[PDB]
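Inputs:
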Amino acid sequence: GGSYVNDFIDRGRVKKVYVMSEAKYRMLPDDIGDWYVRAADGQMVPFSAF
Amino acid sequence: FSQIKDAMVFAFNLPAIVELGTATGFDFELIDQAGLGHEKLTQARNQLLA
């Protein structure tokens, strides 16, 4: 969905900073499982796993 | 007060009229219409004053 983090200046004007996945990784349902979250232990776990 | 070293000290009688009491003179404004920046805006100011 995207995320407005904070601001940065562009040629003098305050503007926004957005962080979001590159399109190809957010087009299809199955692509949801391709994202990993770090676990306390330190290993990566896929959405498919929860 | 023109005496006082390295400082601007002016005594003036209130406009004793309205918002055009200091009369004459002129209030000019130098604008940065591109993302020039402060440094360049300053230089443009000097060039104009010169």
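Chain B touches chain A at residues 32, 34-37 (CB under 8 Å). Flag for discussion at group meeting.
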